[PDB]
Amino acid sequence: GPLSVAPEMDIMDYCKKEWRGNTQKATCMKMGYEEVSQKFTSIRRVRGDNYCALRATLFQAMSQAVGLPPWLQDPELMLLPEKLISKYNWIKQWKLGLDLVDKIKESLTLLRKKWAGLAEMRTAEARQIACDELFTNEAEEYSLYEAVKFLMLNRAIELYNDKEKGKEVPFFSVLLFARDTSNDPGQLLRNHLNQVGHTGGLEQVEMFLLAYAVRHTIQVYRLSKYNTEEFITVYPTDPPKDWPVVTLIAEDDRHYNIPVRVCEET
Amino acid sequence: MQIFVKTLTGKTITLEVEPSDTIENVKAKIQDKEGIPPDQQRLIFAGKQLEDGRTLSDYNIQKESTLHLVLRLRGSMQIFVKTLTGKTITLEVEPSDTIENVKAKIQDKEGIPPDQQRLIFAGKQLEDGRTLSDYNIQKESTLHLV
């Protein structure tokens, strides 16, 4: 079993293990890590299975769960999977990795429950201990991704509709639906969301979508971009006052891992 | 004429361009300023994704006007490079990535020369020009090296 989120490994030893060729590029990788390693003690290897984006984010958000965010706490969320399916039938074009509405409702219900478990925690050691045993597991975890992906799609709909109504929306969504293969929520789903955890991962424009779905700001050290504006890339770019923040690391925009805070340590 | 290309981090690239230039041209321009291969590139203007063939003039694009760059590149693929030593090299990839690019990462990651790298899949040696996609490499496929 190749674990979902590997234990905390000294970051300085890591870049040394992984960036041992003589190449010019490698240097930029080393320097990327050096910067990071000032804020961060260690690094956690997230599994690279095409879910890495959601796993990393959700692991983070949940491990640090302080209170259960309201959006999840609202129990109309339960009734939302039936609602969307009723209205937009093309949602039955949905493609699982691991009838249909019930399954999603169950998935989302799981998310609410699991996240609250970690909020109601007393210590944060306890909180995180708890959180690794979420991602240790097989079936429960992969359900959480079907819930999140759903939430992404909900939000994509929500926004697209608002754009069409003349209403004020986030600019990333304008570009999200500008793509040839993602003109409308239907198109997005058939061509982008369904393939996640199958053919491919989230594009950067869809990172945006992710943060929105769970109302957490995602902030990423992109080593590729070291010594440029983009090195610490933030989704969304102008995040809300309130939204909590997760930090991820991406060597070259192809996989996401977790840098561990000094104080957040085990 | 100057134009601006914006990224989704709000980063602004300035280019000097002519009305008669193509999108193929601009993408190619963006490759120097920023390294990004054109295949990865999409350019958006007025909620339209711009065709490689059609010109800036065609898209009625002007001095000091702003295009948006929306890349095809994605998160979460990993693959394995088994070695003669036993050492497993784990690589962060995109289906798009060429064997040529891999040999290159591999050299990056632990210092072996591509003119010496014999990459296999399921017993097949590997066209430096072909890519992972075409080779049907799932997330977490395992490869051998010589």
Side-chain angles (χ1 to χ4, degrees), chain A residues 1-11 13-15 18-19 21-24 26-29 31-38 40-75 77-78 80-81 85-86 88-91 94 96-102 104 107-111 114-119 121 123-124 126 128-137 139 141-162 164 166 169-214 216-228 230-240 242-263 266, chain B residues 1 3-15 17-23 25-28 30-32 34-47 49-50 52-53 55-62 65-75 77-81 83 85-86 88-99 101-102 104 106-108 110-114 116-117 119-123 126 128-129 131-138 140-146:
Chain A
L3 292 187
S4 285
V5 188
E8 90 172 39
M9 186 176 195
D10 186 284
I11 191 159
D13 295 67
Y14 193 76
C15 73
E18 296 309 289
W19 290 108
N22 214 359
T23 59
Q24 206 90 55
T27 279
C28 295
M29 298 289 82
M31 295 196 108
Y33 285 111
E34 308 197 65
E35 181 33 72
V36 172
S37 86
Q38 287 181 298
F40 308 95
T41 186
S42 322
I43 181 151
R44 298 200 69 182
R45 187 172 288 174
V46 181
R47 187 191 202 232
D49 67 332
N50 263 342
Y51 288 100
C52 61
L54 281 69
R55 180 176 293 108
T57 303
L58 194 74
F59 179 82
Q60 290 272 93
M62 289 181 131
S63 38
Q64 58 149 83
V66 210
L68 167 71
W71 64 260
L72 194 44
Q73 187 145 347
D74 181 44
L77 185 40
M78 304 317 259
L80 167 165
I85 279 129
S86 192
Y88 312 82
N89 210 321
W90 49 260
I91 302 166
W94 194 272
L96 305 143
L98 176 59
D99 156 40
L100 177 143
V101 182
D102 290 330
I104 291 286
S107 170
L108 203 153
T109 301
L110 170 58
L111 186 85
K114 288 284 186 182
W115 200 306
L118 296 164
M121 299 284 326
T123 63
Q128 279 173 323
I129 284 152
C131 201
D132 303 354
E133 296 189 327
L134 190 53
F135 292 81
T136 45
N137 185 262
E141 163 173 326
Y142 293 85
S143 167
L144 308 171
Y145 306 149
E146 303 286 37
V148 159
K149 275 187 160 191
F150 195 76
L151 295 188
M152 285 165 80
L153 183 59
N154 169 60
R155 195 79 200 258
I157 288 164
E158 281 205 324
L159 280 176
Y160 171 88
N161 286 332
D162 290 14
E164 300 310 306
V169 311
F171 184 58
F172 78 92
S173 60
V174 168
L175 306 177
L176 180 73
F177 295 118
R179 308 179 293 170
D180 287 309
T181 83
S182 193
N183 283 320
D184 54 48
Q187 285 248 266
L188 165 69
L189 164 69
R190 290 195 305 284
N191 305 304
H192 290 265
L193 295 203
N194 280 1
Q195 280 72 2
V196 171
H198 277 83
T199 50
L202 302 196
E203 273 167 21
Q204 298 171 6
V205 61
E206 292 150 343
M207 293 302 297
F208 274 90
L209 185 64
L210 182 46
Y212 269 80
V214 311
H216 274 63
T217 302
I218 305 191
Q219 176 206 43
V220 182
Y221 287 78
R222 303 159 60 196
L223 311 180
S224 53
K225 300 317 201 287
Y226 166 78
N227 224 46
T228 59
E230 296 194 289
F231 186 64
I232 310 186
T233 279
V234 184
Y235 307 112
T237 299
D238 184 1
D242 320 311
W243 279 25
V245 182
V246 292
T247 311
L248 306 173
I249 310 151
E251 286 174 322
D252 54 337
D253 289 303
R254 285 162 177 75
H255 167 94
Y256 290 100
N257 278 330
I258 297 182
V260 177
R261 278 279 156 56
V262 182
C263 267
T266 202
Chain B
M1 66 187 238
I3 72 177
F4 312 98
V5 186
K6 272 188 73 213
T7 72
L8 293 155
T9 77
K11 187 207 153 138
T12 316
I13 287 116
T14 290
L15 307 163
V17 300
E18 290 150 303
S20 37
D21 265 339
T22 79
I23 307 315
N25 266 132
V26 183
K27 275 151 168 192
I30 282 142
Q31 182 149 33
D32 292 276
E34 309 298 291
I36 289 128
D39 317 306
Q40 283 184 205
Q41 304 193 39
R42 296 181 255 248
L43 286 173
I44 303 298
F45 191 69
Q49 184 171 338
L50 312 184
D52 291 31
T55 42
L56 294 160
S57 151
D58 287 348
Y59 283 115
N60 289 337
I61 288 165
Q62 306 184 327
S65 178
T66 303
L67 319 174
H68 300 285
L69 179 42
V70 174
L71 301 173
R72 295 201 126 85
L73 186 80
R74 289 158 289 179
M77 165 162 293
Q78 227 172 36
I79 51 164
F80 311 91
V81 167
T83 78
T85 87
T88 289
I89 287 189
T90 315
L91 298 175
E92 304 195 359
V93 310
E94 156 92 36
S96 72
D97 294 347
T98 59
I99 295 282
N101 278 332
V102 171
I106 276 162
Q107 195 157 25
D108 311 317
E110 267 263 349
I112 291 172
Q116 316 224 313
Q117 291 173 51
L119 297 135
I120 318 302
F121 191 24
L126 304 193
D128 309 329
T131 74
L132 280 168
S133 71
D134 320 298
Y135 277 106
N136 290 353
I137 285 167
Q138 306 304 50
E140 290 162 293
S141 314
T142 315
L143 312 193
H144 295 55
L145 198 72
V146 194

